[PDB]
Amino acid sequence: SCDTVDQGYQCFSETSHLWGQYAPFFSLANESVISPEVPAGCRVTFAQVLSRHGARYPTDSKGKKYSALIEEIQQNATTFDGKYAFLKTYNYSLGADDLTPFGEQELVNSGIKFYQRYESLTRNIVPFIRSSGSSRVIASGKKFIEGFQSTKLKDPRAQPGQSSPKIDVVISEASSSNNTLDPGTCTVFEDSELADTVEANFTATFVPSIRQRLENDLSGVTLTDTEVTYLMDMCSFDTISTSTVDTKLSPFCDLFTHDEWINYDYLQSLKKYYGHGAGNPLGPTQGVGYANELIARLTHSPVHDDTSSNHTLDSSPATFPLNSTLYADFSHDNGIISILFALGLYNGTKPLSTTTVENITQTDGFSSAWTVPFASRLYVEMMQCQAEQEPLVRVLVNDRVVPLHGCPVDALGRCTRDSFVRGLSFARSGGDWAECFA
């Protein structure tokens, strides 16, 4: 009941919202200065949703380590008391790689939500649906289609007996697949180590004080900074992996302070910003393939792209139709970051400080948790309005209207379609894709 379909996960918000890309979806609608509502005189005539998979178990790699770390903590320490008591017996049972029940329900909820927001179109148009190829992404796509389909059947205004919505195209993640949802072919970018550098540098400014404290309180234990981030990682996973998702915050969370959570969140924004966003020279270039596919869709014209798009897939109406009206894509956090930036959506954001925390104002609305949480969603709309001949484009990022850049925005955050497309000259020129090889 603090976890709803509409508002996302609002339980324990002072902690749970600062887990970055480990935070469960939470709607930013209340944080939107521009109203998400459709203005009067205006009609939505296009809706594309780009969605992340839902909450997942830790990867096999990381879980090994977590499990290993907690054994070592239990073998060595002589006082587990106060807030530490739970660690004595803690019995690591978490799954691996897979979506969690909670993660599953998130995408069901995203499906209901999408159905309803665009009801006057979802009632009789079957969306064209794509998915990167990874069990968790595919499954999440299908949990979204599941909830969309449940809402459609309860809707008196639906045209019933249309074909199912389904995953029309699973896009491959093999190292040689042109994949626009999360490209894997830009050799120089794949090799980049800028994110690591920033991660190490910024963790040296705040993790040592926590390490000290934790070794102090758990006599006999000796910890690396990395291990400390693992115990922080566990506060997300131990919360949203069990029954108690809605009722109890993980005991792990209480071992760190609010301010310590603030740094954690910001760290995660840094990993994403310098890994895949603007802070990485080739990051937004990872998004140009998808940006050119969106342009195709908005202009009902062929894809012009020579970066990450597959040409067999795109030059064929069956696998890339131009006049559907609704579209749903499912991918990972990393590719979604690159896409958001290639679209200009964060072009009023100043490169994040590598040394100090920057609040959500200083970053002009950018953070991991505000962009790619678990089950995140981007909605691109096109609407036709009373006062104007041309279609107006609008973009929401987890229920927050995000004012377009690179074109004459109005006060409602919108640009005319022609001027929006024109502003995406970066993607239209191929970005820096040529630098993937020299």
Distance linking the first and last C-alpha atoms of the chain = 53
Q: Which has the closest alpha carbon to 24: 260, 330, 332, 241?
A: 241
Tokens of 367: 């953070």
The distance of Cα 196 from the centroid of its chain, to the nearest Å, equals 20
The answer to the question of residue 219 lying near ligand NAG (CB under 6 A) is no
**Is 271 within any annotated ligand binding site?**
no
**CB nearer ligand NAG, residue 108 or residue 343:** 343
Site string for ligand NAG, 401-420 (x = CB under 6 A): ----xx--------------
**CB nearer ligand NAG, residue 153 or residue 318:** 318
Site string for ligand NAG, 253-292 (x = CB under 6 A): ----------------------------------------
User: Binding residue for ligand NAG (CB under 6 A) from 80, 424, 433, 436?
Assistant: 424
The answer to the question of residue 65 lying near ligand NAG (CB under 6 A) is no
The answer to the question of residue 367 lying near ligand NAG (CB under 6 A) is no
**CB nearer ligand NAG, residue 42 or residue 393:** 393
Q: Among all chains, which residue has been given the structure tokens 């979204």?
A: 144
CB of 136 within 8 A of CB of 57?
Answer: no
Alpha-carbon distance of 436 to 438, in angstroms, equals 6
The distance between the two most distant Cα atoms of the chain, rounded to a whole number of Å, is 74
The answer to the question of residue 184 lying near ligand NAG (CB under 6 A) is no
Q: Could you tell me the smallest distance in angstroms from the CB atom of residue 309 to ligand NAG?
A: 9
**CB nearer ligand NAG, residue 178 or residue 368:** 178
The answer to the question of residue 428 lying near ligand NAG (CB under 6 A) is no
**CB nearer ligand NAG, residue 246 or residue 410:** 410
Region from 45-53, 71-79, 143-151, 295-303 binding ligand NAG, contact rule CB under 6 A: 71-79
- List residues bridging with 129 in a β-sheet: 328
User: Binding residue for ligand NAG (CB under 6 A) from 36, 72, 211, 242?
Assistant: 72
**Is 299 within any annotated ligand binding site?**
no
Query: Among positive and negative, which fits the CA dihedral 345, 349, 355, 360?
Result: negative
Q: Could you tell me the smallest distance in angstroms from the CB atom of residue 311 to ligand NAG?
A: 7
**CB nearer ligand NAG, residue 9 or residue 341:** 341
Q: Could you tell me the smallest distance in angstroms from the CB atom of residue 393 to ligand NAG?
A: 12
The answer to the question of residue 225 lying near ligand NAG (CB under 6 A) is no
Q: What share of the chain is helix, strand, coil (3-state, %, to 5)?
A: 45, 10, 45
What 3-state DSSP class applies to 179?
A: coil
Alpha-carbon distance of 7 to 30, in angstroms, equals 9
Tokens of 45: 């005539």
The answer to the question of residue 87 lying near ligand NAG (CB under 6 A) is no
Q: Could you tell me the smallest distance in angstroms from the CB atom of residue 322 to ligand NAG?
A: 18
For the CA atoms of 180, 397, 19, 227, the dihedral, rounded to the nearest 10 degrees, stands at 20
Alpha-carbon distance of 310 to 292, in angstroms, equals 12
The answer to the question of residue 45 lying near ligand NAG (CB under 6 A) is no
* One-letter identity of residue 22: Y
The answer to the question of residue 222 lying near ligand NAG (CB under 6 A) is yes
- Which among 17, 53, 276, 300 is annotated as catalytic? 53
Q: Name the pairing type of β-strands 169-171 and 377-384.
A: unpaired
For the CA atoms of 358, 363, 368, 369, the dihedral, rounded to the nearest 10 degrees, stands at 80
Tokens of 356: 């100090």
Tokens of 396: 């929401």
CB of 102 within 8 A of CB of 55?
Answer: yes
**Is 238 within any annotated ligand binding site?**
no
**Is 300 within any annotated ligand binding site?**
no
Alpha-carbon distance of 384 to 58, in angstroms, equals 44
Which residues within the stretch 309-338 sit at the binding site for ligand NAG (CB under 6 A)?
310, 312-313
Q: Which has the closest alpha carbon to 180: 57, 277, 80, 288?
A: 288
What 3-state DSSP class applies to 227?
A: helix
User: Binding residue for ligand NAG (CB under 6 A) from 73, 198, 372, 383?
Assistant: 73
What 3-state DSSP class applies to 275?
A: helix
Number of residues in contact with ligand NAG, rule: CB under 6 A? 19
User: Binding residue for ligand NAG (CB under 6 A) from 149, 205, 299, 347?
Assistant: 347
- List residues bridging with 47 in a β-sheet: 326, 381
Task: Respond yes or no: is residue 258 known to be catalytic.
Answer: no
List binding-site positions: 21-22, 52-53, 56, 59, 136, 182, 272, 332-333
Cite the active site residues. Answer: 53
* Residues at the site binding ligand NAG, with contacts judged by CB under 6 A: 72-73, 76, 176-178, 221-223, 310, 312-313, 344, 347, 405-406, 423-424, 426
List binding-site positions for 1D-myo-inositol hexakisphosphate: 21-22, 52-53, 56, 59, 136, 182, 272, 332-333
